Ligand binder design. Structure first.
Ligand code: HEM
Ligand code: HEM
Lengths: 181, 181
């Protein structure tokens, strides 16, 4: 199953440390996030929101970039990786109307998204889910986990990405900061 | 809503003319296809199969190709376009493991998918739905409609595509020929 749900509520594997509503409408503060490898039909009664997305095929990375990523990408659930961040992201209609070469050029040629990100592996385990096609309010769910010693580096990564040409097309973004229970 | 379901059975807006089980397991012959804008969990007991997929963003076409397509592409639902063909397609695992530059290279540089297809517009209207990400048995639902005068031209297009490098990665394919009721 390539579908995952993130339920904000009073149960889950992750305790919410804080929620930062970076751009556009935020997400209601909750105690925990519950991650499930499947679709959940309705938001539970005592829960505040449900996000969902699916794992999918590569859209932009070229073979040499994939080879570099797979060489350093860490697994999930490392013993030391007790911190995580869930960052749902929505991109603008102007982004989605662009052609494939236009979006690839902004993504890598102009913003160096992969090249910049590669600097912060193997410290940071990063994963991507897609959800525009499900009709969700966000387009992507991005997931990161790392040990506390890499907290400052991860903030530096965020600083760099938010200044990139690609981020001129981000129109909604929320950070859910988490600690493993 | 970008989700569409295709229910093969006794009712629908389209009459089945024939089903050509081109490659791999076919689809049961039915009287009609009912097309619904949205997901459907269950189908009538009278129905034999359900297909589903979603409309999505461009994955391969570059700006100059989009410009050429927009200049000649017809709209769906032309009064004259009383014939349609629903062609579900599944590509191999080897295809999906490839990186984005590798798949683009096969799609256009080697197979001339868009260049060949442009030769059959404006006669043929077309739409692409995606469903690998939904866990479906096919990867794509492709849709084509045209006036009867263009049936032989469409069959020629099929012949040219099935001979391309890209089609060496197609592992399941069915043609559901339809007439608008
Ligand atoms: C930590 C190191 C990172 C690496 C190695 C990395 C690498 C990548 C790669 C290779 C892709 C393209 C996947 C594809 O071709 O389908 C991608 C997509 C994406 N990443 Fe990153 N990334 C990193 C960090 C981040 C961060 C910090 C964020 C958000 C703050 C982020 C948000 C996204 C989004 C939204 C996409 C989807 C882009 C689109 O399809 O338009 N990534 N990432
Ligand atoms: C009739 C004229 C046609 C034109 C102008 C055309 C053009 C295109 C274009 C530009 C794309 C890329 C869409 C994107 O970038 O996301 C595409 C994708 C596709 N087309 Fe066609 N095409 C035609 C006919 C056909 C036929 C006859 C078939 C099957 C029998 C077909 C099957 C597909 C499939 C399966 C894809 C998705 C490829 C993938 O994502 O791997 N097309 N077409």
């Amino acid at each position: 199953n390539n579908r995952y749900s993130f339920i904000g509520g009073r149960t889950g594997q992750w305790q919410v440390v804080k929620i930062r509503n970076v751009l556009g409408p935020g997400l209601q503060l909750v105690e925990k996030v519950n991650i499930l490898n499947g679709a959940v039909a309705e938001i539970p009664l005592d829960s505040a929101w449900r996000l969902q997305g699916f794992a999918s095929n590569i859209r932009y990375a070229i073979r040499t970039e994939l080879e570099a990523l797979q060489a350093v990408q860490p697994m999930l659930n490392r013993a030391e990786a007790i911190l995580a961040v869930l960052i749902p992201i929505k991109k603008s209609a102007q982004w989605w109307e662009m052609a494939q070469d236009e979006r690839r050029d902004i993504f890598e040629r102009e913003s160096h998204h992969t090249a910049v990100g590669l600097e912060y592996l193997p410290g940071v385990a990063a994963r991507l889910l897609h959800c525009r096609d499900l009709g969700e309010e966000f387009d992507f769910l991005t997931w990161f986990e790392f040990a506390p010693e890499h907290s400052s580096a991860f903030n530096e990564l965020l600083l760099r990405m938010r200044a990139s040409k690609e981020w001129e097309y981000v129109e909604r973004e929320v950070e859910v900061w988490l600690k493993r229970l």
